Structures are given as structure tokens and as C-alpha cells.
Design a protein around this ligand. Sequence first.
Ligand SMILES: [Zn+2]
Lengths: 64, 121, 145, 182
Amino acid sequence: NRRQKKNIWLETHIWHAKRFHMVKKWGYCLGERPTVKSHRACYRAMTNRCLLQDLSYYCCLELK
Amino acid sequence: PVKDREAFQRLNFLYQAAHCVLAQDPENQALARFYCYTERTIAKRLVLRRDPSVKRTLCRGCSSLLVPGLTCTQRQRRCRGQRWTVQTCLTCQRSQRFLNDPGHLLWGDRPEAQLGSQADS
Amino acid sequence: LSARQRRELRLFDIKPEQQRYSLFLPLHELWKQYIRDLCSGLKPDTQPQMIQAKLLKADLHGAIISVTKSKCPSYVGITGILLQETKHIFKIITKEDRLKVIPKLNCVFTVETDGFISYIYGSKFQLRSSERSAKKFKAKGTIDL
Amino acid sequence: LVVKTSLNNPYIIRWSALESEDMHFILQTLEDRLKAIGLQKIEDKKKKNPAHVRKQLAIGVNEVTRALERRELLLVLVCKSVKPAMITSHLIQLSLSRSVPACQVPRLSERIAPVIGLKCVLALAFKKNTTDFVDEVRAIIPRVPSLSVPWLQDRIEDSGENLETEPLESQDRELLDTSFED
RNA sequence: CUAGGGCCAGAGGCGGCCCUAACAGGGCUCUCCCUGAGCUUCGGGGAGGUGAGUUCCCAGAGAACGGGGCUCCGCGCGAGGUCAGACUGGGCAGGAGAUGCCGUGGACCCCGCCCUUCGGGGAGGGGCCCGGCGGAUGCCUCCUUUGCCGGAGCUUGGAACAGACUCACGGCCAGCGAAGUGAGUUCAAUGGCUGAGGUGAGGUACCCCGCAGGGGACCUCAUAACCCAAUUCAGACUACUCUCCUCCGCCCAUU
Ligand SMILES: [Zn+2]
């Protein structure tokens, strides 16, 4: 909580920072590259297999 | 015992060179101070059994072996009880107490006069 | 204590440079008589490794040196008695008042004895030279000059 | 057999020669020149009801040392009080620059005893720069035997070292102190 | 199998802050110790709190406690004279040092202002110790002396409110046999040749412009070493010098 006073520290941000490269950016610190070499493996999982992302930066305007 | 007897010549050679510097030129003491610092460094690393009166006149504050006699202050006073000789060098502003008194002359001869007497070959 | 001892300095200034170098002449006589009383053997010939042991184990403070080969040519051709000694340099005084700081990095010194001449490669001779007479002098490395 | 070598270097600075007769009559001459002038000094100090007070008679170790430090042409009289006298009068030996440190071993208390003063003065000196006290004392000053100190340089370009490696035995101090710990 | 978790005991958590979970990581600031050719407000290395244990011989009173060694002092005990200020009377101590001046010295005591109301922190004043300078009287009012006890002090030795080393502030508990690493091999592949440009340099009989000159063009030399991946990444280490940004030192020559 004391560190989260400065940064954002999402719920899955600690799961990402456990095994992915997290670089500070224009908004919060997010995942740039994986720690393991999987540049061909990400495409091979993108074509036939399964792959997911973490998209939490999308702010929402609800209009009533 | 031979190799220590060798380094004895080097130590009292540095000690005599410090006296040569302090008797040669006044008020510029850097050679004698460096020689006394080297002499104290040798005795600090290769630790030996040195003489008690000479080493306490080396003034272990930084380095001054002949300097407090003719340049800096050595006087006498009476602080509380027995009279004390105050030895103060004008380099690091440290003091040395040495009590000198007639009733304790045997304790003045207790470390010193024995080694003169009990010296056997 | 060390930073409190580093207030004034323990090193030379401009004022001891003009001390009329003939006053430093009895230091050479002191060193020469110390070599005469240390070795105490001259006439037939005897044991150059005894000479190497005396030149390794003794403090060279206050001795006559002359740079005979060095990597800098301007350092070569400098004689004089030495006054200080530091980690990788040492300071000498020469003729008419000026002093020089000679580094022990890659150089060799001719030392003139009473009747001998000794070359000393000042490469391994370093690191607070009281450590030289103490311990740790092994056989490593050659110096090409 | 526990015997350890110790580098002890008391290069022995011996005192002046024991010239009994010469010192014996010049000290009586000093007593005559002190009694010949008078006692205005004790009458000005104690005030028992100023010209003789103007001498700077350094009495005690500290006054003699502050007289011998700066730059002063004067005369010092030193007596041996106890056996620890080399440490105190080593200042007087070392301060030979422009002064005369005359040392008398048995006789200096017999100088202070008839002179009207106080308790027996151990170290004495007198600063008498440019004022006329007694010219005969200033004639006696280059006549006393001077002390040559080979400890520092002895003013001549010549150095001599001596080797004194004392074997300290544990058995000697063991039998003199007689102490044991377990 | 969310180990941003739980279990017995503990109530201790490695100078402080900030970032990360790659917490044997990095940066800043404060102190201590050691060393260094730039006077030093400089740089490098190591350490920071608490509790326990230890530290050749000799010396010294004590290397952790106490006693045995000496010196100085008495809101305590005891003895004698009692002759208790008589010309400021008597006794002790004092040139072997009583006292006077000075204070960005002390882990000491008391008063005392500010933040604050646990340990407290900071400007000041009084006593003792400490250092510097110059020297004559200070104590008590019935007096004197030793003995026990209490407090303080001591020259040594590499060491004496110390420093150095070691241990301790927790332990235990969680795997997936199925495709194929912007190189993925394992009886162990991958920096091969040529030419022009990059950079460090030299020379010019080339071209354009008119400030003696500047810019481009042509030719040659040098572009190395350390070493080699088998799962990856973060950080620290050690081995570098074709190469770039700074702080520098010494020596030589000039104005
Ligand atoms: Zn000192």
C-alpha cells in the first residue's frame, strides 16, 4: 500500500512483474517484453493456439 | 631472533634520521613526522617489544619524538593531589599526564631498573 | 582521527623547498655510514643474494637514487636523494632548489653504494613500503625496459 | 625458557664531569655575589613592615622552560632531586641553543639554604638580558665545563648508532613479582 | 495448486529515505576506520542498531566481577590535651605551584528558555576535570593524630565510556512425461572472402567559392583483445582497450 501510494499496482500487476518485464510509460508501468524468449512462440500461439492480454488502461465515460 | 635484530637497525635508523632532521632544520618537520609515522607503522604491523620511555616520548597522537622538547610544551603543575607533568604538542592538541614524585621512586625503578639489573647473557 | 589528522598536512610545502640543499648533505653521510655498519664486509667478494636480502628488507628512506631507464624519457637522467615514499610514487630532492615526484610505475633506479652499483626495478616495489620489510614478496612477473 | 629480545635505546646522555673543586669555589663565589647585593626582593614580595626585583629569577620547572623556549641568553642551575631527574631535566639538556645549563649534583640545595627565601629550589634560572647584575658571574659563565650532547647531531657532521638488544627474561620478573593466575 | 499464505513460540526485526520483487540489487544523505603524487568542501574500500562469548608472553591494581599494592579527601565511629583568637592569636600546606584570566572539550551534577509530554533533542549560567599564559600566600575558628569504610587517581602494554572477531533476531510447508528460444547445438553448427563509406591519421600536380583560406574529391595504413551461449531474465564480480564524457597528477618546453 505504501508503494501503491506512488504507482498504480494493479491486481495482476504483481503476477506480471513476477515473470515479465515491467517498464514505466506515459501512464502506469506495464509489460513491454516477456522474460523468456517467445517471439516466435507468441506468433505460434496467436495463429492456432490460445493467448491473452491485460487491458486495464481503457478509461470509461458513462453518459446518462 | 636474527631477522628481528635486522629490523632493529632499520627502526633505530629511522629514529636517528628523525633526530637528524629535527636537529638540521627548525619548524619544518615533515621528514621527521613521516619517518616517525613509518617507525610507528612498522611497530604496529610487525609488533615488537619496544622501550617504554622513548616510545612515550614519541607522542603517539600523530608523530612527534623530539618536537615537544624544544618546540612544544612540557611543564609541571599540581592538579588534584600528586604533582603531574603535562606534555602537550602543538599539532593535534592532545595531552599527556606523567606523575613525578619522590615517594614513589621504587615504582620509578620497578619497570626500568630491573632490566638493567637482571640483564644476563 | 585520520580526517582530524589531515587538517594541516604531513606533506611538504613551498617553504621547505628553499632549505639550501647542502644542509641535506649529512643525510647521505648518515645513510652511507648505516650501510657501512649494516653490511660490514667488503674486500674479497661475498654472496650477492645477501645483498638482495639487504636491499629488500631495509627501508630505502633517505637514499641516493638515479633514474636509469623509464617509460618517460624526461624522467630519465634525474639523480638525487629521496625524501618521501607513497603507494606508487616517491618524492626526491635534486640540485639547486627544486624537487621532483618520481612514480614507481615502470622504471628502474641506479643506487650508488660505497663501492657497488645496484639496479632496482621499481615496479613491484609499492603499496606502503613498510609492507616490503613485513611480508609477502613472491616471484611474479618480469619487466622489459 | 621464555626469553624475548627488546629494542631498548637509551643512548646514555651522561652529565658534566664531576669537577668538585672548581664547582665548589664558583658556587661559593655565586653565594658571595648573591649576598653582596641585598634582600630587597623578599622585602618587596613578602612585604615585611624594587630594583632587585627586576631580575627574572625563573623558579620551578615551568618558569625555566618558558624562559628557555623562545629566544633568551641566560643561565640555568639544575640539581638532581630524586633518581627520576633525567625526564625533567631532559628539557634542560635539549634546550641548549643560546643558554648555559649548569648542573650540580650535590650542592644546589646548599646554595638555597643560606639565602633568605623559601623551600629548597630544585631547578633555577635567571633572565638578566641587558641589565648589569654581576659582571664576574658573566665571566664565570664561559668558564664552567660545557655539556656536549651526541643524541641529536652534536653540531658536528658525524653520526654514531649503537645496538642495545636487551634479552627480557620471563623468569626474572616472575621471581621478582611472584604472581600466578589460573 | 494467487507463498500480497498458514502453523507452535516470539513481541525482536541489521543507520535513515526512495524504486524494484531481480531485497547477497541500485541511488542519495550522516558518522566511524584505513589508504591515496589533485590542501582536503577531494577520491576509493569496509562498517552502522541490540544481546552473549573471546582476545601470544612480559608488565600493570584491574584485558568479565571482587579482594590483596600505594597516594589524596571525610555531614561516620574513637583517643588525648581542654591551655577554647593573646601584638589578626594558633595549626597545616605552599617556587617540587596556593591563585588569577580564557573556553564551538566531558557519556557528570543543578538551575533554566524553545519543539514536545516514553527513551527526550538544542542556545546559556554555577561546581569538578582539561588545555594555554603569568606567578605568593590559601584553609579553619578549641585543636591534633593513626585505624576501618566510602570516593577518586596512576608511567605499563599494539589494548582500559574502547577497539576487533564470532554467533543470534526464526524454522517448516507448494509441481507440471507430449512438440519445437526475434541463434538453440548437444560424439557438441553459427563472428568465412571481396569493395566502398564510419572513425583515428598522413600526402596532394583534382574541383567549387575569393579573408590569408574554407568545403568536397583521390591513395595507403589501424579497426584489436577478453572470450566463447545449451532455458531466460534482473542485479553484483572478475578479464579488456580500436572507442567516447569528465576529475586529475608528475616531468619537459614557451610567454
Ligand atoms: Zn602528537
